[PDB]
Amino acid sequence: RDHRKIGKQLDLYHMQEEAPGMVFWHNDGWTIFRELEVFVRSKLKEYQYQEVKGPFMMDRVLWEKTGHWDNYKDAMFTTSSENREYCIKPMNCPGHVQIFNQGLKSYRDLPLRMAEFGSCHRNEPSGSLHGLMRVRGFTQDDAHIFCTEEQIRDEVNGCIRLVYDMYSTFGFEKIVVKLSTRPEKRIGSDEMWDRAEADLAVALEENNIPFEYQLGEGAFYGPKIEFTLYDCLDRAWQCGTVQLDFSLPSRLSASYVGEDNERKVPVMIHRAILGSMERFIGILTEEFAGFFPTWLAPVQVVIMNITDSQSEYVNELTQKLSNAGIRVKADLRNEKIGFKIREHTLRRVPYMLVCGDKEVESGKVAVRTRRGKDLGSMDVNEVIEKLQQEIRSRSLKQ
Amino acid sequence: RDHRKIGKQLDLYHMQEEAPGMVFWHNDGWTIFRELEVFVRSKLKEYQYQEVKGPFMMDRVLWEKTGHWDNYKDAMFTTSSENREYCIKPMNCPGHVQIFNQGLKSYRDLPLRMAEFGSCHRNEPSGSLHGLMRVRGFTQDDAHIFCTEEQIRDEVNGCIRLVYDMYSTFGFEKIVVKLSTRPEKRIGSDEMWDRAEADLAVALEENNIPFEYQLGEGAFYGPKIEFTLYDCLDRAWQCGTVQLDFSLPSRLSASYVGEDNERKVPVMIHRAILGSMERFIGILTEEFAGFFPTWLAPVQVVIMNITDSQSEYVNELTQKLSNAGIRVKADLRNEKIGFKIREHTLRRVPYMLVCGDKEVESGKVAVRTRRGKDLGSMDVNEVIEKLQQEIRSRSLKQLEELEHHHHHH
Numbered sequence: 088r089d090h091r092k093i094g095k096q097l098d099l100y101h102m103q104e105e106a107p108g109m110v111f112w113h114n115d116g117w118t119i120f121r122e123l124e125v126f127v128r129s130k131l132k133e134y135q136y137q138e139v140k141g142p143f144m145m146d147r148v149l150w151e152k153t154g155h156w157d158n159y160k161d162a163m164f165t166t167s168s169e170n171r172e173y174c175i176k177p178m179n180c181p182g183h184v185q186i187f188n189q190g191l192k193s194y195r196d197l198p199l200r201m202a203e204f205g206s207c208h209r210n211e212p213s214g215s216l217h218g219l220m221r222v223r224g225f226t227q228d229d230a231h232i233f234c235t236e237e238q239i240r241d242e243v244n245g246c247i248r249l250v251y252d253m254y255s256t257f258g259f260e261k262i263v264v265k266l267s268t269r270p271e272k273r274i275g276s277d278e279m280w281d282r283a284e285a286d287l288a289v290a291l292e293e294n295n296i297p298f299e300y301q302l303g304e305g306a307f308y309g310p311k312i313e314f315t316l317y318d319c320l321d322r323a324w325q326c327g328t329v330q331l332d333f334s335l336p337s338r339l340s341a342s343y344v345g346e347d348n349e350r351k352v353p354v355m356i357h358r359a360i361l362g363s364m365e366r367f368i369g370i371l372t373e374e375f376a377g378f379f380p381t382w383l384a385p386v387q388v389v390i391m392n393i394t395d396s397q398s399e400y401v402n403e404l405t406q407k408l409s410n411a412g413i414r415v416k417a418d419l420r421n422e423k424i425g426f427k428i429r430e431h432t433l434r435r436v437p438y439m440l441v442c443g444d445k446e447v448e449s450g451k452v453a454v455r456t457r458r459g460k461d462l463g464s465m466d467v468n469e470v471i472e473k474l475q476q477e478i479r480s481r482s483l484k485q
Numbered sequence: 486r487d488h489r490k491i492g493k494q495l496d497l498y499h500m501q502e503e504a505p506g507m508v509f510w511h512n513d514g515w516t517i518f519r520e521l522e523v524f525v526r527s528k529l530k531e532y533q534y535q536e537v538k539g540p541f542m543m544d545r546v547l548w549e550k551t552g553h554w555d556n557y558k559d560a561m562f563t564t565s566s567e568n569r570e571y572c573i574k575p576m577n578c579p580g581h582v583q584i585f586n587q588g589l590k591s592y593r594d595l596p597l598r599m600a601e602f603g604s605c606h607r608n609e610p611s612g613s614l615h616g617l618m619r620v621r622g623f624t625q626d627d628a629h630i631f632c633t634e635e636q637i638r639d640e641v642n643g644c645i646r647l648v649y650d651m652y653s654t655f656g657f658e659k660i661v662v663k664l665s666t667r668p669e670k671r672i673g674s675d676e677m678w679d680r681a682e683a684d685l686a687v688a689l690e691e692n693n694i695p696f697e698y699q700l701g702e703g704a705f706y707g708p709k710i711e712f713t714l715y716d717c718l719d720r721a722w723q724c725g726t727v728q729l730d731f732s733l734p735s736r737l738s739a740s741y742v743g744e745d746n747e748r749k750v751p752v753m754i755h756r757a758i759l760g761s762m763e764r765f766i767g768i769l770t771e772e773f774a775g776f777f778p779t780w781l782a783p784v785q786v787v788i789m790n791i792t793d794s795q796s797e798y799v800n801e802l803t804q805k806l807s808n809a810g811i812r813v814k815a816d817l818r819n820e821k822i823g824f825k826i827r828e829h830t831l832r833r834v835p836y837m838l839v840c841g842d843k844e845v846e847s848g849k850v851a852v853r854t855r856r857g858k859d860l861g862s863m864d865v866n867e868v869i870e871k872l873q874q875e876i877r878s879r880s881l882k883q884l885e886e887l888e889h890h891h892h893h894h
């Protein structure tokens with residue numbers, strides 16, 4: 088099953104030729120995107136990250152300084168104002184360094200873990216575009232960690248732990264790890280590259296992760312661990328990545344006062360856990376075939392009456408569920424109950440609540456699922472409590 | 486005092502010459518921005534809006550169709566790829582119409598209320614930039630409501646109600662209102678403009694809102710109700726806006742099937758309640774002189790020790806308040822208690838919890854506020870419940886406080 092067809096069927100998003108690789112998120116697709124942001128934030132809280140927002144564009148001069156212009160030009164969108172050229176950002180790192188550079192920093196501030204849901208644009212050749220997996224405007228669940236050389240091992244380990252921790256929520260069985268080494272166009276000395284490649288290889292082996300080399304595929308600023316996930320046709324897509332950069336901070340004048348009083352340049356680790364939100368949603372859509380786990384489902388519950396005798400009761404339950412934090416809709420249409428059920432089933436709504444007279448009298452609801460399971464009559468507080476529990480726990484199934 | 490000074494004092498954001506009018510939101514400024522988004526979303530839910538996201542750029546051809554290119558050229562950033570020219574969006578409406586245009590719509594789908602926290606770029610002259618109040622990259626709390634002619638009155642009324650409901654949270658009740666009428670460069674006939682302008686004026690009159698006309702200040706596509714808020718120098722800033730558009734949907738081929746199976750063009754109401762998130766934060770910053778309401782405060786509570794002795798206790802409490810969802814920091818420094826309180830007062834932290842030996846003994850805290858008030862000792866659990874209630878109700882004022890800091894009484 089193809090996420091593109093499922094995305095159309097569940098009204099998640101669309102694209103058009105007046106904006107190639109530019110996603111229009113419809114309400115239900117945007118709901119998923121927003122839930123993933125909530126999830127990422129909850130994890131960024133426990134793993135102790137700041138969250139910032141950098142400028143959408145910056146002067147071409149700044150991108151020249153980083154090496155992005157010489158080592159990354161063709162991918163960049165540019166725009167002008169008052170005789171000055173700007174690049175629309177393809178990466179968030181330089182903005183993060185600019186924020187780091189505001190206010191004197193010391194060893195007391197490190198590791199400084201700076202996250203952003205960073206909207207990037209890259210002028211990917213139009214012939215390489217594919218659904219939500221490869222677009223031109225995407226959002227990374229990005230962060231840069233500023234740390235000392237002594238903190239590299241612990242911070243790289245932390246990023247690797249975060250990847251497997253987050254990925255366990257989604258239950259991915261195939262996670263293939265690559266270590267992408269020095270590309271033909273790069274910055275930093277060969278000696279820097281030897282150290283950075285070794286630090287990553289050693290981090291993988293310490294974490295017991297089998298990996299394959301991807302020779303020459305590292306970033307221009309540093310080598311990359313890549314966590315690869317697979318779509319329905321077993322095509323490989325880079326999602327998670329952890330990268331070690333001994334070059335950009337220096338190019339952007341980042342420094343801090345060390346514990347030993349020597350002013351030094353911080354090491355920077357770049358990482359994304361999901362990758363891009365768009366690509367990750369494309370992957371999830373295929374992984375679940377549109378049957379999103381309840382916490383991610385655009386609409387979690389639909390409540391239906393059989394006739395207008397139960398309209399008032401349906402409205403009452405809908406408000407009760409909505410106040411409980413459940414994404415719930417009432418379907419009060421003048422249509423046969425079996426017509427309504429089929430619509431919501433095809434829409435992959437996890438739970439459907441049917442109210443006839445028997446339900447009104449008893450204060451219960453007849454519960455069924457999008458897999459055709461019939462859970463029979465249930466008391467209303469118990470469905471609320473079970474739903475809340477499965478949402479809060481982000482349960483992979485139920 | 487100017488929000489730009491307060492913004493530096495509280496480490497909210499910065500700007501640089503490498504990116505004129507593009508905000509760098511630091512952690513604490515972004516905290517306020519995100520809390521405002523959560524607040525708007527609570528209202529989108531209650532008032533039954535969809536929430537979408539349209540892309541940053543679209544073909545110049547589309548912008549020419551709307552009338553934007555003719556009537557809005559100077560303000561648009563453009564970029565290109567593979568010999569096609571794109572506009573970075575200055576407004577979210579055309580993208581909302583593209584979403585509306587996917588799939589057949591019927592009268593049963595209306596009113597369709599489509600919200601977005603819409604990231605816009607307008608190439609404002611660099612001479613006109615001012616802090617957070619006039620930038621080049623800003624985020625509107627935007628929506629478009631697609632509705633029938635018969636629904637205009639109710640839907641405009643709903644937007645007006647939403648403005649006063651949201652502004653009431655901040656204590657803004659006597660709002661200056663204008664009705665901005667047809668500008669010299671416009672699309673649509675005189676007849677359409679007469680109707681749109683009357684509809685908005687009737688809505689204001691029906692809601693008992695006094696207003697003035699502002700001649701020639703309407704959008705190229707329709708007239709605008711404007712809700713003005715004022716900064717520290719009493720300069721007028723457009724924040725809320727409600728606009729009526731009988732032009733763009735037709736230009737962009739929007740239609741729905743009516744009750745007689747006939748093709749109809751929907752009316753579109755545009756509205757932003759806060760205006761932009763950036764400008765609204767600028768306004769709050771100045772109005773409150775940085776004393777943001779607890780629910781908005783980047784750091785809600787600071788817990789501090791007197792000596793190394795209470796460090797373990799402070800750390801326990803910081804963790805406890807953090808698990809309770811409160812934005813809390815520990816201050817473990819070897820500085821006098823008065824020194825700490827002055828610093829966190831300049832940082833506008835609502836509550837400061839002072840931990841001496843006697844506090845460690847009794848499992849309590851000595852409570853101080855950023856307004857100089859000594860609230861005595863309270864139980865840790867009591868402080869948590871009261872903070873949680875202050876946060877959940879988005880209360881304008883603090884524990885046992887008559888009047889919060891605000892410039893305009």
Ligand SMILES: C[C@@H](O)[C@H](N)C(=O)NS(=O)(=O)c1cccc(-c2ccc3c(N)nc(Cl)nc3c2)c1
Binds near residue numbers: 177209211219221225
């Ligand atoms: C992790 C970052 O700090 C680092 N600067 C970085 O950008 N590394 S990266 O390997 O280039 C990277 C990380 C995460 C996502 C992507 C990416 C790139 C292009 C994409 C594209 N064209 N479409 C989509 Cl849907 N996702 C994408 C995701 C790239």
Ligand SMILES: C[C@@H](O)[C@H](N)C(=O)NS(=O)(=O)c1cccc(-c2ccc3c(N)nc(Cl)nc3c2)c1
Binds near residue numbers: 617618704726761763
């Ligand atoms: C309400 C919308 O749907 C409508 N399309 C629209 O954009 N109306 S609008 O009057 O032009 C409008 C609404 C809300 C915010 C603004 C606005 C414009 C420029 C701004 C700027 N340069 N800086 C800042 Cl901080 N805020 C701004 C807010 C404009």
Ligand SMILES: [Zn+2]
Binds near residue numbers: 179180
């Ligand atoms: Zn990076």
Ligand SMILES: [Zn+2]
Binds near residue numbers: 756
């Ligand atoms: Zn609009």
